[PDB]
Amino acid sequence: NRRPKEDAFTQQRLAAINPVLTPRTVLPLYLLIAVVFVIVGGCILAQNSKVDEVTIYYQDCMTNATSSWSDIPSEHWQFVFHKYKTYNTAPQWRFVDDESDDFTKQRGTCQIRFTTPSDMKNNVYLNYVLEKFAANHRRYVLSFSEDQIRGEDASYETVHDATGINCKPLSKNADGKIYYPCGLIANSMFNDTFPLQLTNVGDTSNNYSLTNKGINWESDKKRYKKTKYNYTQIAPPPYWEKMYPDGYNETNIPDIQDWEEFQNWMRPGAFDKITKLIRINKNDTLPAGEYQLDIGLHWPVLEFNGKKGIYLTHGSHLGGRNPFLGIVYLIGGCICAAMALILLTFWLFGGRKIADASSLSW
Amino acid sequence: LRTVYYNMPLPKDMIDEEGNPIMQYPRNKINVYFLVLIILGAFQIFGVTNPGLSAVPLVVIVIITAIKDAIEDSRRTVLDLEVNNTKTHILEGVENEDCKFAKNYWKGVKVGDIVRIHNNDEIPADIILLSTSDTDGACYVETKNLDGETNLKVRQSLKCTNTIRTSKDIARTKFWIESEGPHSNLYTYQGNMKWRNLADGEIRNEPITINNVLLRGCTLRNTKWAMGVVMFTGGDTKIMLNSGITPTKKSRISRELNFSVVINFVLLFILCFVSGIANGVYYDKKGRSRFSYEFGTIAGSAATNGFVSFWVAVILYQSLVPISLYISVEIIKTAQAAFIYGDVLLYNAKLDYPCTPKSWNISDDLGQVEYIFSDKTGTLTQNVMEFKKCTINGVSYGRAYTEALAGLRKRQGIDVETEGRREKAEIAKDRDTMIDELRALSGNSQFYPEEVTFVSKGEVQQRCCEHFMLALALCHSVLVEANPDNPKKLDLKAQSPDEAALVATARDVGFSFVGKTKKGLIIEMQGIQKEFEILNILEFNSSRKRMSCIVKIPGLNPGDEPRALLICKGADSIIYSRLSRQSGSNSEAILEKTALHLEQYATEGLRTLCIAQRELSWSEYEKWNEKYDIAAASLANREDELEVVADSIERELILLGGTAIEDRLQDGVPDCIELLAEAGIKLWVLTGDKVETAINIGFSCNLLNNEMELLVIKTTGDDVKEFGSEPSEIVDALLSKYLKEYFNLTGSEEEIFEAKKDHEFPKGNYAIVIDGDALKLALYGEDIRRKFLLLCKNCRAVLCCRVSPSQKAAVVKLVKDSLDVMTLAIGDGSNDVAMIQSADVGIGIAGEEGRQAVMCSDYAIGQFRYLARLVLVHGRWSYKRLAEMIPEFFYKNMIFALALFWYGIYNDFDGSYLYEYTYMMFYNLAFTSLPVIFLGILDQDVNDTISLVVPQLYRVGILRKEWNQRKFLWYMLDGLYQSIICFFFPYLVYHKNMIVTSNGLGLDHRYFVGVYVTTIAVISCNTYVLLHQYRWDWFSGLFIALSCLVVFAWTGIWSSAIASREFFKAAARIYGAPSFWAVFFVAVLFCLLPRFTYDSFQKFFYPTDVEIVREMWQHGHFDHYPPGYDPTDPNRPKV
Ligand SMILES: *[C@@H]1O[C@H](CO)[C@@H](O[C@@H]2O[C@H](CO)[C@@H](O[C@@H]3O[C@H](CO)[C@@H](O)[C@H](O)[C@@H]3O)[C@H](O)[C@H]2NC(C)=O)[C@H](O)[C@H]1NC(C)=O
Ligand SMILES: *[C@@H]1O[C@H](CO)[C@@H](O[C@@H]2O[C@H](CO)[C@@H](O)[C@H](O)[C@H]2NC(C)=O)[C@H](O)[C@H]1NC(C)=O
Ligand SMILES: *[C@@H]1O[C@H](CO[C@@H]2O[C@H](CO)[C@@H](O)[C@H](O)[C@H]2NC(C)=O)[C@@H](O)[C@H](O)[C@H]1NC(C)=O
């Protein structure tokens, strides 16, 4: 009748492999981990020592530079190659002018001339570093609006008070217009202009092009689309006023379908320093020698003792160069090996034998 | 009194005294909305109230007290929720023939229906019956929750109250009701309905006693349905008010669990004012980058005293992990109690009754029992009386060898030397019969080889032999009912099992009795129905202690009326005292050695009953019964005249012989007691018996084997004094000196500082048989009960004999209170229901004629032989499972929700998150809250046939080693370690912060680091449950892989959807990047490496008993034991 359904699950007779930790299933499990994570710790640092970078900080180029060429004081640059270990041909600044056309606190095209004796091989990436610009506060990274990013319209209340993301400080001026990229992220954008080509200087004068097409992901334009409204009742945010001194006309509406250095700034970097990609070249190789680029300064970094800079690199499959992710395998390998030759230094001389069930046979 | 009207729609806004809801009764629905305001306010959309540092005594107090007990109860709100609606029907609303009430729909549960109850439907309230379909309303009351008895007492609705029955005759009554209120009673109610007719159309009464008031706590069997108005409400039904006297708050884990939750909050409020003192040292710096590009006040006070709308966005989120724990163990304990119920080896196949758990809450508290309290009659003996021996005028022929195995303690004779001697004598009984219709398959009777040529024929010994032999079957209390399967067989029901032991044997002795009818009682002769009859009955009572009858003996000769004689039987208190000097049977060479032959029966452990006879006068034979109709049967039966008239004329009493009654054991009890007492459980037998047939079975069912001290209490006094003069009085000094002598003979440890205690099993074997009236004088006052305890604590198995049924519940409260130790109480009967409720786990044997100790129990095992299968298999599993997953729940939250804090030091404690808004939601719901359910359900540390063979694995439970607070603080420090690995391993990939992509495009949002952090946290604490469980298998190994790739498949579905802002492609950006898969294989290692080392260091060099057994189990020490094995069974080999 009510015999309770014997089915090898309700009596818990599930087929079961019953693992037992002896030194027969453990020492072939510590040795197999210790021999993998060293030959993976060698294969990764083989890949992650060939990676070459160029890092130049230019934040002080307005003050501590001259109209003539002067070398960088070397607390503002470091770069390492895999064919040239010791390499001390220092790059040099040139601050052109204070051009006196609505002059601001920080302006004048700092032109940096660097020297690379190797080849950033196929894909060459031009990032930009930004130390001590804390861009991860509570109110900062929650201040944009997804209706404007996806291109659609906006009311005043759709961007002022919304769940999570809202343009709470920066949705209207005294005139009371709608800012088109509202929020403290897009309002405080890095607006230092970069050249579209690294000039070849001294030897050849055959230039090296750097497009900003395909500067982030191809499957990303389906949320950064073109705007839906073309209104004169919108106007740039209060720090874009040098770039648009009279507002949006019918022509200067920013298509963020392909204005792709802005799509990088709408992901706020999550730490102290920030590197966002701004110039790529998927076509050519970078021949060795010496180059020069022309950065037009517009970003007032010096008041909070911060930094700006350059990060020219060729990326691996593991990204850029970082000695951590290879050296932590050989820490993860030379500890499980050291805990394989301690748990056998004790097992051969402590030496428990598999016996009767103790403490009940005492 | 009380007011209930009929056919009203029961409005809500009315106050009028025609109204039924204006009495304002409560419901049967005796929270969720408070949980919703937590989750909405927690981190995102709808924050109702986030005041800051003022709710810090508001949220931590409600969840540990007001929300723990709401989730803990699994029968007050779960058996109250699933019972609804209990057959809502469609014969409702539209109805016609006017003067016919159009039917209504009031609520779900209400008063005023005509809603039926079918078979297997839990009745929503207390009902009085109105109509059925059978004849004479052939229905009854059932006793599953609140009522208690076994038999099916027929109960009628009145013969014109049962005129209305159809759905054409449904709305055809109306009358108002007198009732009563709250009384905390079970079998008392008053009422009367002057109800309205159907046929006549007039108004007519109906008397009400208790028996038509069936209850809410019922579930109907064996009949289809019944009808009635829902007369009484559900909110006054007293089953939750009578049961239990305890709130069954659980055990040493779930009463110490809520202290473990507070240590989680206390060691997380510290990391909120270390955040508080580190966010005030950030505002007074003013050289940081928070003023140019950020537009606010040049001050602090985000909400109050810094960024506190983040800090109380974590406290209100970390107040969801204790809420998730209480839901996590009320799915484990509901499942660990649903595999006891579904087990075929805890099944009473003779009665078709599985081990039904009457408390789904506790199963863990089985696994840490070390005091079993029992009862001899019922719970470790068979509790059917059968007739073995008898003495007849000196001769007592043949000995059915059952319990001379402890009177002959030094060796047993059942091998070949005494059993096969009398088994051949039992074959000598059954291979031939002198009279037919002897059943000979269930007899086991008083065996009778031959007396005079196998038929017994000047021999006056036989003349009064069959006189009393038929008399014990002629006159007795119960009546011989019929077997419906076959008319040739006769079954016998009784409430006194000894009295039906006589009648069932005397049929099988000879002269096969069939019919006990009020028409008459036959004796076969001549082919004509020669037939006898009785006049009346005299009831055996415990206030009477004896039994007589009033029998008819005819006048068998013409022209004369001969002389009759009357019967007497019972216990031997006053039987031996009244001597015989005038009858033909005097105190002589017969009468004293047959008393010795009844003194010998207790020495081999039998229920010594006697049989005797009466003297009268000839002319007083009518005078003896002419005052009985006016003084005994009319009104004064329960009053004290029946003892007075049974002492007046019988000043001396005539004794002839005696009848011996013996009680078997239940099946497998001497193996079960052998099994449980070596597992570490000091078991105490609280019996209702004297010394020498409770210590007789104490060697039969092998709880006493070697040591028992010879005790001579030899007192007859009492203790009316308390203040001084202790050596002046006899009894109080002597039993207390007996305590200190048998201290100072066995060790000078009279002691006052009670705070020392071991739970270790005692080394020297000892046993106490204390004598009922001694423990009453030992549990009485202060400083004598503690001399009683540490005496009994230093023993294997004490026995307490002649114990009052209130003293049973007092001696189990003594060990439970004065020591920190939970106890068990097993039972069957209304004499230790107070013992079941007293102990922390009350097991109850079911299936008998008494079952008040079944619905009041905590489990419902069939025989006692299942107790060592419930405790030692399903109980120690429920403590090695659940004292492990409880610290596997306060580990896997701080592997994850402490990296919210470690991204405070890289955020200046300013208050940005690191996870999605759905990696905070779906972490403790889908990602990792699934396998700690299955370490709680599918973790057999050793197999089912292995914990029975090695029962000493249960000593982990007594000593409290699988659960202590110090085990817990090495699993919060194991989360605080692995929350710097699961965070700083995706930090130091980004710490120089290059690109981390093969395609060079880079990904460094806050949310693309919390996919590097969550996905190496969900894997590095799903393997940690996989590595720590015993018995990896096919079902829990499956759903620990399908919780390892729900994290890879909830990114790949929600991030690819456009509704997730910042996200369109966190599948391909992250998982197709070689930097994720190169750090996913390091922090999975570094989270397991400091514990798979320690689990290998501890399981090699300081091992526990539960791996030493399961590594012998793979060498093959336990190969020959079959699957589906229990030693405590006779029908299977023990090997
Ligand atoms: C883009 O580059 C401009 C440089 O022209 C960055 O500087 C910001 O320029 C605006 C326009 O002049 C400044 O607003 C003005 O500030 C002065 C005080 O110096 C005040 O008196 C005026 O009434 C007006 O508000 C703005 O202050 C200045 N930014 C800072 C930090 O001083 C601008 O930040 C860049 N935009 C980006 C990166 O989005
Ligand atoms: C609206 O304003 C924009 C700039 O704010 C004007 O764009 C400039 O047009 C002149 C015309 O020759 C160019 O020389 C500039 O290079 C343009 N600016 C940029 C950034 O490319 C635009 O012409 C204005 N609309 C009208 C109708 O005059
Ligand atoms: C290649 O680079 C040369 C660079 O030469 C000078 O560049 C500056 C500014 O770029 C320009 O003002 C001068 O006229 C250039 N010539 C001299 C003699 O100073 C430029 O010609 C172009 O940028 C590039 N030309 C080609 C053909 O690619």
Ligand SMILES: [Mg+2]
């Ligand atoms: Mg009993």
